[PDB]
Amino acid sequence: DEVWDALEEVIHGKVVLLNRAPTLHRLGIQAFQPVLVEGQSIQLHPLVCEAF
Amino acid sequence: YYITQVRKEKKGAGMAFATPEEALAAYERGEVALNAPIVVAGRETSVGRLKFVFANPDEALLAVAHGLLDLQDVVTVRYLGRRLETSPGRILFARIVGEAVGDEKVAQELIQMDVPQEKNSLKDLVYQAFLRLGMEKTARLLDALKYYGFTLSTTSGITIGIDDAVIPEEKQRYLEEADRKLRQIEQAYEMGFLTDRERYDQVIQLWTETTEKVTQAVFKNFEENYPFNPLYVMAQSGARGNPQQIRQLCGMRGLMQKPSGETFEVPVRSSFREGLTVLEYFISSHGARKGGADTALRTADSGYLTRKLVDVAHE
Amino acid sequence: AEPGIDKLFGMVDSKYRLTVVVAKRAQQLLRHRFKNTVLEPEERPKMRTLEGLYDDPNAVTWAMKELLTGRLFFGENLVPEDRLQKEMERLYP
Amino acid sequence: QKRKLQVGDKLANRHGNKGVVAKILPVEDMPHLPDGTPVDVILNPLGVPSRMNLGQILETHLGLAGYFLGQRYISPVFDGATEPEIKELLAEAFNLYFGKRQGEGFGVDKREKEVLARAEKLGLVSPGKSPEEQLKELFDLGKVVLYDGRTGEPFEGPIVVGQMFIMKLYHMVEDKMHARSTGPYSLITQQPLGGKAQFGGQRFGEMEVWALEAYGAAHTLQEMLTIKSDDIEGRNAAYQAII
Amino acid sequence: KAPVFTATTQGDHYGEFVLEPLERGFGVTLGNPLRRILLSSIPGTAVTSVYIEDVLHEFSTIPGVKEDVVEIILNLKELVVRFLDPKMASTTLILRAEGPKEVRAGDFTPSADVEIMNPDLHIATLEEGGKLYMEVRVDRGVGYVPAERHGIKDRINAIPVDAIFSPVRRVAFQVEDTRLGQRTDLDKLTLRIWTDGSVTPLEALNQAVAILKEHLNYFANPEASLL
Amino acid sequence: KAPVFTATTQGDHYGEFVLEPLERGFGVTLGNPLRRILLSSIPGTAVTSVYIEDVLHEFSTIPGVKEDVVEIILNLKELVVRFLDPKMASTTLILRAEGPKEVRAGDFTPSADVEIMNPDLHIATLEEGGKLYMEVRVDRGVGYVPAERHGIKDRINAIPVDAIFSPVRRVAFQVEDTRLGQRTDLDKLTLRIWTDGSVTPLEALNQAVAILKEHLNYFANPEASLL
Amino acid sequence: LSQFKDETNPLSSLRHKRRISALGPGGLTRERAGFDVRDVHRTHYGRICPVETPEGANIGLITSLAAYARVDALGFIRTPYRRVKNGVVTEEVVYMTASEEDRYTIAQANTPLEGDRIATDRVVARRRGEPVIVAPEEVEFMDVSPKQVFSLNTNLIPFLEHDDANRALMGSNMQTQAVPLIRAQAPVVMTGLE
Amino acid sequence: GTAFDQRPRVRVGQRVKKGDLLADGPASEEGFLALGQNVLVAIMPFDGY
């Protein structure tokens, strides 16, 4: 937990970017908040999932 | 959609009553349906708009959610200082929207309180919001429709069985008619009237319309008989599907197209739920697997064009 | 969503001008470790944690809340590029 | 390696319905049945009317009866069980299933009554028939009464269920997931290596460059074109500064 | 294993509660039961029927009054009172106002021990020389009891009305996945309860938990009938 | 009114409980919440640790055996063993088999504070001259923890196994129309419990109500605030 | 024509072996294949699978062999059939070549067979792959089974006549992308070819 | 990377006829191609998951 939390401390604020190929619409690259979750998978908002 | 869907039964038959009492007793006796458009005194109103008088929304939910009413029924409400005739879910919509935006006064002011909310209405609402309200406001509204909409979809639990698309009984009939008309066109081929090509046209058009005499019946069946059918609703509200798709999943599939490109001369009849004979499937697979490369290849020419346009208008 | 965006966008004439402002200003905030800014101890963008609730180290957000108040001044050719970096490095270590 | 079905791993059936695993779920809260039997998947009734594959529907339809009869079925391609056949197997499976309820000292659940009623209003079950027969027409339709493990209340309309054949495909998140910060660089040009095994980051296509240009992110684009790709002193002054 | 249950309310109407953190699945076990009982139980005022002079039918209009009969019925349903002594489970509120006037819930004539917690409310408007008199009936109970249910007529022409029993309006809880340290499987269950004012949300919920553990302790005395 | 509570059991496996009469819809409000926790928090065993003389891993094949180690674990996860003492935190089961015999849960080495509830559980089939030594440590725990989350470090080859504690197999409740009370539309709750050997159904419902009432009184004094 | 074996599962190699590539050194390439070398020819039938093929840009380029199809010395593909004389199904099993097919008039397996005889006066058949109504007299041959009309994997799909080719494609190929299972279990509904 | 296993199906002794299965395959169940498994499928929307 020494890290699993501190990493959250450097995470808050700044947000990363997710890109789905092919990149047609510029909306195929959007900026989301890095919320650490269990598992190897990646979660995404069901609505904008259309733009990708 | 499902929640805002205004339900109307047909059992009540829409009779005539002098006082609300006969209609009432009728409802209890099972002589009339709840949302059935009946007539009392000199006016007409459903048994619901009478048996349910809500002086506010919270009363509506408190009664319905408690189990004394169905989520979608025609009732009388006092929502936002006015006497209307709508459904509990109908009120719920404008309520969620307003609770997301924060003042329901502008919310209900820009929304449709008359008809169920399908793709279009939802879209329009989002636009009007982002334009009149502001960005974050709309982010909120969207997420609201997300959470509540999703949960509602789970509530209904709408599913798909083999019997969730029933083919109109007019299939066998209206098509067996064309089975005679073909034989007629043939008699014309052997009577000299029709040649080999105009016969091809008479048959191809006979089936072109024969596809309509059925496809029409499909939708007329989902509308006249089973308005709450999952397939129909799904394709209607814009949840999933298109008319031709529902056509091939209920009504007749239609004539295919030979890989040489000239359309076939033989009718397929049977739908996906009916099941296709070996022949039908193989005959279809021609133009079917044709379309695969028809799209997949062209996806390249898309890039071919894109890159160039970028290399011209970039500056 | 970033609260204030409707107001932020509604300030500058362009779109990106806002980005230039937020960026440069945030830079000034991380250069001096927040001892420059215009915010009172209740305005400070706090970051809740299981440990203690400090002020959010993210400069971007700090700049957000900074401009949202309007206490900041921005514009082209405002002051000489010389003293602007000369007195900014003086007042604060 | 003994790999257990994870969250996000590929899964599909014989009817060409793909999908990944989105978040498994505690047996506790599950849409179970009056016999306390929770389902195992909960698939979405959307890609059926679009992709037009009614096979999984009939497969599951037969599976629904085959559950209570335990008899394995063989339906040859383009020659097989039809609606009447399966309908018969459902009438049979029900006639012994509901009878197991009568025998075990029970009757028609109130919640079931609720569903049968609101479904009778839309004409899903022929009016004038007792709940036994209504739930009989429903059970044979492929649908039944499901209780939500979370709430405890029955779902509005009947939900089809049954036994279906599914497959865990090749693609596994465990092997397809990856990321890096500072890795190896190509000898020729100092560009980061690609792929997975090479221990390298992804590529920023011309498409991406254009997208960023359309957003207007000047520096974010330059980051992709300098400090984070082939730049020499830049990446070093990055790992220097950030650290 | 160490719940932090807290509450954020406002006035006697709105109130919120947060039990965080918790075990996976429990938030749901708490949510429905509390909810189902909070709107199906919890005793309260709930006006039942009303009588009116010159007005026999629940339809026929009343001259001198701007609003019709139904509008008044509605406003009467929105009104809320309370019984001071546990003895009185049923009382009768009265009122009479003539001439041009703005009739309100405050204008209502008093009762033995009954306090109208909703003094400012529109009941009806009276035109010039408007003759209005009414004796409303108020009992106590729980849940919802439409006009169909109770057949109350304490007079010749009296008019039964929907009984709004449960002082609570809507609850609609929400459980959200919360994280503390490790194991993101946790419950942040939050509950928003609305009250008409008979009792603040705190008291309502606290009453519900009682109606819960009480029912729970009902499993004491087994009876072995082995098959 | 007082609820008639009856408890009908069968063995340590089956049991049914009925509480009638009750309030309208309440049968769900009570019956489901109990079922929830009932299928989760009930403590159980289903072993943890396993070791055999000649094994290097979970895939190894021992001479004289029909199945591999993983198929033996496939039956080790289905192995129920009750503890005659509530104070034990662990144990070690011992097993030995020679000659042409079918090994089973009943073939183990009996000891104090242990009883197998399924001596008929097929483990491995020992063929001609097939010699097999085996031992397991069946610890008691709560919930579901796969072997990948718990270590052993017993010795050279110590192979962990999944843990299915939850002695409760399945639970199903039904809400019907009860004839035992004044008014109508009331409920007769009937909760049916199916568990294996470890704990009796009655006991199950007992501790279930225990944990339910515990997390229920967690609603004690909060911390106020208002905007 | 020589690549890494497909061992992803047992059926995998069995499919990878029965695959027919139009590519390779002396084949064609992704350039010169528009439609022709992709599209499904009328004669395909009980020889080449009308559906199974990679969903990518290679659709129609590489297909598989039919479960009953065979390849003689000359290289042509001959599909099994059954001779018939005036509504009498003969035990004669003929492997007709591609050209041989266009000559005779073949019926279907779903034809109305009453005790080794024809039932209806209008039976399903064709010529050169051209479905037409036919009489009980003019029937020269018949199909052994609809199974030959498809491939292996495709024949493992129950109620396939109730679905669409698009999905059947993946429905087949993914079965090759399939993986074994420790507790693996055969479907309670099959086609009986397993 | 997919394992190749053969599970013996026969007793310590019994007489069988030529063609009878003595051991399964990696994907085989009693001489039946077994890919995946048969579960209880629920066709219904679930919170958009």
Side-chain angles (χ1 to χ4, degrees):
Chain A
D1 315 89
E2 301 281 303
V3 289
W4 248 215
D5 296 54
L7 178 58
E8 277 273 296
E9 187 137 34
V10 256
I11 284 172
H12 190 291
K14 301 172 172 172
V15 301
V16 281
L17 332 95
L18 275 72
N19 166 228
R20 169 71 205 298
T23 317
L24 329 89
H25 264 49
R26 64 160 181 196
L27 277 298
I29 304 175
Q30 283 177 159
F32 300 80
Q33 233 293 320
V35 186
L36 288 164
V37 68
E38 342 267 45
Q40 330 233 46
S41 307
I42 298 179
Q43 299 177 52
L44 194 60
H45 193 293
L47 289 200
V48 271
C49 270
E50 168 207 50
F52 298 88
Chain B
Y1 181 73
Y2 163 75
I3 53 121
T4 48
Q5 174 70 66
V6 281
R7 188 213 299 177
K8 48 170 177 179
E9 297 155 283
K10 58 173 290 181
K11 169 180 173 284
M15 299 167 242
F17 307 96
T19 70
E21 319 307 330
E22 298 138 287
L24 250 179
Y27 182 86
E28 273 86 296
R29 289 173 299 191
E31 288 160 47
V32 177
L34 175 60
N35 310 292
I38 60 174
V39 177
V40 172
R43 306 278 280 187
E44 106 279 307
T45 164
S46 81
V47 191
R49 311 176 198 175
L50 304 164
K51 190 203 189 57
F52 291 87
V53 174
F54 300 106
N56 65 71
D58 286 309
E59 199 195 320
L61 299 168
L62 172 62
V64 186
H66 203 174
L68 298 77
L69 185 52
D70 286 304
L71 307 72
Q72 350 83 313
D73 277 327
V74 212
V75 293
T76 38
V77 80
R78 194 167 132 167
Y79 183 40
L80 297 183
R82 252 191 284 203
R83 168 187 309 182
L84 230 185
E85 312 167 68
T86 55
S87 151
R90 180 58 100 272
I91 314 293
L92 171 69
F93 192 85
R95 178 209 182 189
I96 317 173
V97 171
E99 290 211 60
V101 178
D103 55 317
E104 61 187 307
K105 53 176 283 182
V106 60
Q108 177 270 165
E109 180 222 5
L110 42 75
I111 322 165
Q112 20 247 306
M113 293 293 101
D114 4 293
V115 300
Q117 312 298 55
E118 35 77 40
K119 261 262 68 48
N120 283 292
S121 67
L122 300 181
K123 174 102 303 189
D124 297 305
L125 220 288
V126 185
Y127 188 74
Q128 238 63 34
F130 186 59
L131 184 86
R132 196 187 183 294
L133 293 309
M135 197 171 265
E136 326 160 19
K137 290 272 189 179
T138 308
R140 287 187 184 176
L141 171 63
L142 293 161
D143 277 294
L145 295 138
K146 168 203 72 174
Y147 176 49
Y148 265 76
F150 274 142
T151 308
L152 293 175
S153 307
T154 315
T155 313
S156 38
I158 320 173
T159 184
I160 314 185
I162 179 68
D163 299 295
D164 292 39
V166 59
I167 326 101
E169 62 113 69
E170 354 286 334
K171 170 177 258 287
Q172 170 168 45
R173 202 191 92 189
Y174 273 137
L175 101 84
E176 80 171 65
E177 290 163 47
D179 264 296
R180 190 169 197 197
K181 184 69 80 63
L182 214 302
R183 174 176 34 189
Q184 170 179 286
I185 307 169
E186 216 175 15
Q187 259 73 298
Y189 186 70
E190 300 145 59
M191 242 295 254
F193 273 124
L194 279 180
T195 73
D196 185 278
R197 65 173 51 267
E198 39 225 60
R199 187 193 55 68
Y200 168 70
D201 295 294
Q202 194 154 294
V203 164
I204 214 80
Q205 69 161 302
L206 166 61
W207 296 123
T208 301
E209 52 156 291
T210 299
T211 306
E212 287 320 285
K213 258 295 180 179
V214 292
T215 305
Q216 289 300 297
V218 173
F219 282 37
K220 283 194 186 77
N221 215 58
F222 284 114
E223 300 174 50
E224 286 281 64
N225 304 311
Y226 325 101
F228 257 84
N229 175 267
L231 194 66
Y232 174 65
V233 166
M234 265 185 271
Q236 271 310 310
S237 58
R240 197 95 173 184
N242 72 66
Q244 286 179 50
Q245 257 179 34
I246 308 310
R247 180 193 70 182
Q248 305 181 309
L249 288 181
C250 205
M252 155 207 291
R253 203 191 196 297
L255 268 70
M256 295 302 132
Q257 167 184 286
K258 189 178 177 183
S260 61
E262 44 165 44
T263 169
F264 252 83
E265 207 174 310
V266 204
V268 308
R269 305 133 170 278
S270 301
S271 155
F272 281 51
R273 85 185 296 284
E274 300 181 67
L276 281 60
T277 86
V278 196
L279 306 112
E280 296 188 45
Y281 211 111
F282 184 49
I283 300 161
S284 65
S285 66
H286 286 317
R289 220 220 286 149
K290 165 177 286 183
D294 263 295
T295 45
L297 211 173
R298 253 166 29 74
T299 69
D301 283 45
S302 179
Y304 160 74
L305 201 44
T306 308
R307 188 167 197 286
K308 293 187 158 182
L309 273 57
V310 179
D311 226 312
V312 67
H314 76 97
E315 66 169 52
Chain C
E2 224 73 10
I5 184 62
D6 284 289
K7 266 186 178 177
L8 282 181
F9 277 169
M11 281 198 73
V12 288
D13 41 302
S14 95
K15 174 179 190 160
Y16 317 97
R17 183 171 281 288
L18 165 62
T19 303
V20 180
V21 166
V22 178
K24 295 190 179 188
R25 181 55 181 168
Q27 265 263 42
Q28 297 181 294
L29 269 51
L30 278 178
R31 164 61 70 69
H32 308 293
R33 243 169 308 177
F34 314 125
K35 289 184 180 174
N36 51 308
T37 176
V38 278
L39 312 186
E40 314 292 17
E42 81 292 321
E43 287 175 356
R44 320 250 293 185
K46 251 59 191 178
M47 182 177 67
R48 45 185 36 176
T49 308
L50 346 166
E51 185 172 51
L53 290 68
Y54 314 130
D55 2 288
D56 183 34
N58 184 209
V60 187
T61 322
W62 264 93
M64 299 272 82
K65 186 105 169 182
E66 265 196 311
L67 181 53
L68 296 173
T69 60
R71 310 188 201 283
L72 305 165
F73 299 119
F74 58 85
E76 301 179 291
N77 267 296
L78 167 66
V79 292
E81 187 49 64
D82 165 276
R83 317 175 212 280
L84 181 53
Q85 194 193 313
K86 192 171 188 174
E87 286 174 299
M88 192 45 152
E89 267 49 55
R90 169 207 63 188
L91 288 169
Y92 319 110
Chain D
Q1 303 184 183
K2 180 183 70 177
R3 284 194 225 158
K4 277 175 159 79
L5 190 61
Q6 204 220 304
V7 180
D9 292 323
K10 200 94 81 71
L11 266 167
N13 52 40
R14 284 175 299 178
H15 302 284
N17 192 288
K18 292 225 194 188
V20 283
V21 171
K23 191 176 69 181
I24 338 166
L25 173 69
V27 58
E28 324 160 55
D29 29 312
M30 193 63 68
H32 53 285
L33 287 152
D35 45 305
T37 299
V39 274
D40 303 307
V41 14
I42 312 173
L43 276 184
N44 199 303
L46 282 175
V48 221
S50 166
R51 315 299 169 180
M52 300 172 52
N53 35 43
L54 315 190
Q56 56 197 329
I57 310 300
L58 318 191
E59 176 200 3
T60 296
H61 277 329
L62 253 180
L64 190 66
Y67 177 83
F68 309 94
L69 328 173
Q71 41 185 287
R72 311 218 169 189
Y73 306 123
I74 297 297
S75 172
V77 198
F78 279 79
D79 189 35
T82 63
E83 284 195 4
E85 296 183 57
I86 311 172
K87 266 179 170 63
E88 150 65 6
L89 283 175
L90 268 301
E92 170 198 306
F94 188 74
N95 283 329
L96 282 302
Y97 156 70
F98 193 62
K100 178 151 191 170
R101 192 183 296 184
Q102 307 188 187
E104 283 188 300
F106 257 162
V108 187
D109 187 55
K110 199 173 187 185
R111 296 163 287 173
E112 287 168 357
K113 301 266 192 175
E114 191 179 306
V115 186
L116 292 157
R118 74 180 305 106
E120 185 178 57
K121 304 256 285 298
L122 71 97
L124 196 56
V125 284
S126 60
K129 305 286 185 179
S130 57
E132 298 70 61
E133 310 169 298
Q134 304 194 303
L135 207 155
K136 190 175 182 189
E137 301 158 2
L138 232 59
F139 177 94
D140 114 272
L141 240 59
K143 342 165 184 174
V144 264
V145 202
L146 276 64
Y147 304 109
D148 192 28
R150 319 180 296 171
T151 66
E153 304 174 295
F155 293 99
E156 313 251 46
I159 302 161
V160 314
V161 283
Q163 289 174 293
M164 181 208 272
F165 185 87
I166 308 87
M167 183 63 243
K168 163 186 152 180
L169 277 69
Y170 184 77
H171 278 64
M172 218 108 293
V173 195
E174 180 185 312
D175 300 288
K176 276 281 186 178
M177 197 218 95
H178 181 47
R180 98 168 193 189
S181 60
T182 302
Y185 306 108
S186 183
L187 176 46
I188 28 166
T189 169
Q190 291 316 294
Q191 310 271 42
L193 306 189
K196 199 204 177 191
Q198 235 89 189
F199 201 54
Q202 319 298 299
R203 177 207 158 192
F204 216 61
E206 286 180 281
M207 338 289 281
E208 286 82 275
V209 178
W210 304 337
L212 261 58
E213 278 173 40
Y215 278 94
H219 285 52
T220 308
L221 172 72
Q222 186 167 161
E223 308 268 290
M224 297 271 91
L225 264 116
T226 50
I227 301 160
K228 282 185 279 181
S229 61
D230 36 25
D231 196 303
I232 14 87
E233 141 261 356
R235 62 193 162 181
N236 286 35
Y239 198 69
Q240 159 72 47
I242 294 162
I243 227 76
Chain E
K1 14 156 299 309
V4 199
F5 176 84
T6 48
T8 80
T9 68
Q10 183 132 323
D12 52 342
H13 39 272
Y14 201 9
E16 295 190 315
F17 313 88
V18 186
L19 183 70
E20 159 193 54
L22 199 59
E23 168 62 4
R24 39 124 77 174
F26 288 173
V28 178
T29 315
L30 315 174
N32 314 295
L34 289 170
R35 166 160 193 256
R36 297 185 72 67
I37 298 180
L38 278 158
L39 305 179
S40 79
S41 305
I42 288 68
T45 154
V47 47
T48 154
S49 179
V50 178
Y51 169 70
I52 3 77
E53 294 200 71
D54 319 287
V55 188
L56 322 93
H57 202 186
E58 189 250 290
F59 267 49
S60 63
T61 188
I62 168 63
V65 186
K66 295 254 283 185
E67 306 93 304
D68 84 290
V69 34
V70 183
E71 199 53 42
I72 322 308
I73 302 174
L74 278 43
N75 296 296
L76 294 170
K77 283 182 288 177
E78 290 189 303
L79 185 48
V80 50
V81 306
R82 177 165 63 168
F83 296 77
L84 301 164
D85 54 345
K87 175 199 303 309
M88 198 165 264
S90 70
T91 192
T92 307
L93 295 68
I94 339 281
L95 179 272
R96 178 187 294 247
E98 79 302 279
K101 180 74 175 172
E102 177 78 309
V103 179
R104 308 162 118 275
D107 279 69
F108 244 71
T109 230
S111 187
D113 269 335
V114 190
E115 50 163 64
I116 297 184
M117 298 189 60
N118 183 19
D120 306 312
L121 160 63
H122 190 43
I123 305 301
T125 309
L126 271 292
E127 304 180 58
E128 287 295 344
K131 304 287 188 178
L132 173 278
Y133 171 72
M134 61 160 52
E135 31 185 288
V136 317
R137 228 283 189 97
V138 174
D139 303 51
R140 61 171 72 193
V142 294
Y144 201 80
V145 172
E148 173 187 56
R149 299 250 182 284
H150 63 69
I152 167 171
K153 256 147 58 189
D154 292 312
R155 184 104 181 198
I156 164 173
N157 280 290
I159 299 174
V161 184
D162 305 304
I164 166 186
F165 276 117
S166 192
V168 198
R169 314 267 216 190
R170 198 216 176 191
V171 261
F173 64 102
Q174 183 228 285
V175 53
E176 56 193 69
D177 316 286
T178 164
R179 199 172 76 76
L180 181 53
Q182 285 181 49
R183 62 166 291 97
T184 194
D185 312 289
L186 316 171
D187 296 37
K188 196 187 175 292
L189 171 54
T190 303
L191 182 46
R192 312 159 306 160
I193 313 170
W194 287 305
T195 62
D196 68 325
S198 282
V199 277
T200 177
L202 194 67
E203 297 168 4
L205 176 63
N206 272 306
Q207 183 166 285
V209 313
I211 314 160
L212 217 32
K213 82 150 61 188
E214 175 206 59
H215 275 58
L216 270 180
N217 281 312
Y218 275 152
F219 306 140
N221 163 51
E223 303 188 62
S225 65
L226 327 155
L227 296 174
Chain F
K1 290 294 282 70
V4 188
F5 175 57
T6 74
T8 300
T9 41
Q10 194 71 300
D12 294 349
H13 44 281
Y14 201 175
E16 285 188 54
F17 308 113
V18 184
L19 186 82
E20 59 185 73
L22 260 166
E23 202 50 65
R24 175 175 68 188
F26 256 54
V28 186
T29 310
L30 328 177
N32 191 274
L34 271 164
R35 170 185 182 279
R36 290 184 58 71
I37 328 144
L38 213 168
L39 312 146
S40 61
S41 307
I42 301 299
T45 21
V47 74
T48 136
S49 188
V50 190
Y51 171 72
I52 292 181
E53 43 168 359
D54 305 7
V55 164
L56 304 85
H57 50 93
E58 202 178 315
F59 312 115
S60 198
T61 60
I62 318 166
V65 190
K66 179 195 167 191
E67 309 102 304
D68 44 33
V69 181
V70 77
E71 178 128 53
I72 303 176
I73 288 186
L74 158 145
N75 303 293
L76 282 175
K77 289 174 58 173
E78 314 269 284
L79 157 73
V80 55
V81 36
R82 186 182 162 192
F83 271 13
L84 303 173
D85 166 51
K87 278 287 282 68
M88 291 185 105
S90 297
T91 189
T92 157
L93 282 69
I94 306 297
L95 179 50
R96 270 276 198 72
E98 282 59 45
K101 71 197 300 165
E102 297 195 308
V103 197
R104 56 199 67 174
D107 272 45
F108 271 94
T109 296
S111 184
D113 311 75
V114 286
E115 41 160 339
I116 251 70
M117 326 302 262
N118 49 5
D120 315 70
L121 195 75
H122 200 309
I123 297 299
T125 320
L126 268 51
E127 64 159 60
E128 198 75 296
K131 296 187 182 298
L132 179 59
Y133 174 68
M134 192 191 299
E135 48 176 52
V136 291
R137 271 172 68 264
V138 183
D139 304 19
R140 52 201 302 174
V142 51
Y144 170 68
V145 46
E148 294 83 30
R149 301 220 286 186
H150 78 75
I152 296 184
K153 199 209 160 298
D154 267 343
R155 210 208 306 92
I156 164 72
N157 299 295
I159 299 175
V161 302
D162 303 11
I164 321 171
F165 297 122
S166 296
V168 43
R169 183 143 313 166
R170 73 182 87 103
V171 173
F173 75 96
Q174 191 173 306
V175 178
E176 314 118 300
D177 294 304
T178 176
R179 196 198 293 187
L180 310 193
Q182 288 91 299
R183 68 160 49 73
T184 181
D185 65 271
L186 296 188
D187 299 4
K188 47 169 292 178
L189 216 179
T190 304
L191 200 143
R192 327 173 90 175
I193 293 182
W194 285 283
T195 65
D196 43 39
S198 306
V199 180
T200 75
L202 235 161
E203 281 170 45
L205 178 55
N206 267 69
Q207 49 223 337
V209 179
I211 305 177
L212 179 43
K213 188 192 171 185
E214 168 164 31
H215 289 277
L216 181 48
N217 57 44
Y218 271 164
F219 286 58
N221 44 291
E223 299 156 58
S225 63
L226 317 88
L227 295 174
Chain G
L1 291 309
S2 65
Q3 73 264 61
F4 202 39
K5 180 182 179 180
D6 218 349
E7 295 215 321
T8 326
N9 62 73
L11 185 75
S12 191
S13 67
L14 176 50
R15 190 202 75 153
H16 202 187
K17 284 204 288 289
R18 298 189 79 275
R19 258 282 178 76
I20 331 164
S21 167
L23 295 76
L28 298 91
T29 183
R30 293 172 203 67
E31 265 61 278
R32 47 170 161 284
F35 264 52
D36 305 56
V37 264
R38 293 176 164 157
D39 223 327
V40 199
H41 198 288
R42 320 168 300 193
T43 49
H44 270 52
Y45 217 88
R47 312 188 204 287
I48 309 89
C49 191
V51 281
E52 179 173 300
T53 176
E55 30 170 17
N58 283 60
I59 300 168
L61 290 303
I62 313 96
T63 36
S64 306
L65 191 64
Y68 279 111
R70 270 275 169 286
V71 186
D72 57 54
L74 302 173
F76 309 151
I77 296 177
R78 309 188 278 200
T79 183
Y81 284 132
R82 265 197 274 176
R83 178 77 93 89
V84 43
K85 187 84 169 187
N86 305 65
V88 181
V89 186
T90 313
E91 315 312 295
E92 189 155 293
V93 196
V94 178
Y95 269 68
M96 260 151 57
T97 325
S99 296
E100 278 274 53
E101 193 162 296
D102 301 66
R103 173 180 280 282
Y104 315 77
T105 81
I106 305 144
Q108 294 290 311
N110 50 290
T111 48
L113 311 114
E114 49 120 75
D116 189 72
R117 312 196 97 173
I118 288 179
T120 193
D121 292 39
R122 309 159 54 78
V123 203
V124 283
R126 59 180 197 295
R127 295 160 166 77
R128 277 183 67 184
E130 173 55 61
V132 180
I133 43 175
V134 185
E137 292 84 353
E138 33 182 315
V139 48
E140 317 171 15
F141 267 90
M142 189 199 67
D143 245 53
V144 181
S145 179
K147 306 268 188 202
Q148 63 192 302
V149 196
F150 296 85
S151 79
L152 277 51
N153 321 74
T154 317
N155 266 289
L156 296 174
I157 308 164
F159 305 139
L160 180 57
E161 76 262 273
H162 293 286
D163 304 64
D164 184 67
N166 284 297
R167 317 309 304 179
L169 186 158
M170 298 159 236
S172 306
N173 274 42
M174 299 184 295
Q175 282 183 41
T176 300
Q177 276 191 304
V179 308
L181 274 326
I182 272 295
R183 209 160 185 173
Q185 157 192 47
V188 196
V189 41
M190 344 159 103
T191 50
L193 286 66
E194 306 66 42
Chain H
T2 57
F4 187 96
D5 202 7
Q6 309 168 310
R7 307 187 174 293
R9 300 299 167 188
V10 264
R11 61 184 46 184
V12 192
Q14 64 167 184
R15 45 201 56 189
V16 302
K17 176 167 288 302
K18 55 176 180 176
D20 277 297
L21 185 74
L22 318 175
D24 283 321
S28 165
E29 183 182 62
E30 314 310 289
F32 300 106
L33 169 56
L35 256 65
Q37 282 145 301
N38 299 306
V39 302
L40 277 46
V41 61
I43 302 315
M44 46 165 300
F46 220 74
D47 298 52
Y49 272 95

